[PDB]
């Protein structure tokens, strides 16, 4: 239900994950570097060019925006 | 006071998030551990009127707790 799209050497990705963990959010994570299917979903399903991208109930939070995770997750 | 002060402690994920945010933005801050540094703890509580970490002081202005957008604004970094 919550999906995190991340890639190597991505400091904002690590930060977003720590925020989700601290909030005990139940997410699944994908690597758009290793995983071409995840990459295609990032571009074609979510119309996003960058990581981190977080999808919450199909709402797309693209790039490094810690305050919106707070908005949409509670 | 240093221009940018970060008050933190161990086992404080919001503190880690704030410090990493500041690092990613290449902010020139000084940090203090209020568990290990009793003087820093006293400044947090008695000078800055804040009861928890993270607390960031930016040119004298106290930002208590996890306030990323307010940090961004005060640091003139966005």
Numbering used by the authors:
A (entry chain A): 3 to 76
B (entry chain B): 1 to 78
Question: What does the publication say?
Answer:
The thioredoxin BC3987 found in B. cereus ATCC 14579 is conserved among all the members of the B. cereus group, including B. anthracis, B. mycoides, B. pseudomycoides, B. thuringiensis and B. weihenstephanensis.
Substituting the conserved Thr8 that is close to the active site with Ala has altered the hydrogen bond network and the effect of this has been characterized. The BC3987 wild type and T8A mutant structures were refined to 1.4 and 1.18 Å, respectively. In the T8A mutant structure, all residues 1–78 are visible in the electron density map of the corresponding high quality chain. In the other chain, residues 3–76 are observed, with lacking density at the side chain atoms of Asn76. The pH-titration curves for wild type and T8A BC3987 in Figure 1 are similar in the pH interval 6.5–9, indicating that the nucleophilic Cys12 pKa value is not affected by the T8A mutation. Following the reasoning above, the wild type BC3987 has two titratable thiolates with pKa values 5.1 and 7.2 while the T8A mutant has one thiolate with a pKa value of 7.2 and a second thiolate that behave different from the wild type. The efficiency of thioredoxin insulin reduction is measured in this assay, and from the curves in Figure 2 it can be concluded that the wild type BC3987 has a different reactivity towards the substrate compared to the T8A mutant. Disturbing the hydrogen bonding networks by removing a highly conserved Thr residue near the buried Cys resulted in decreased efficiency for the BC3987 thioredoxin.
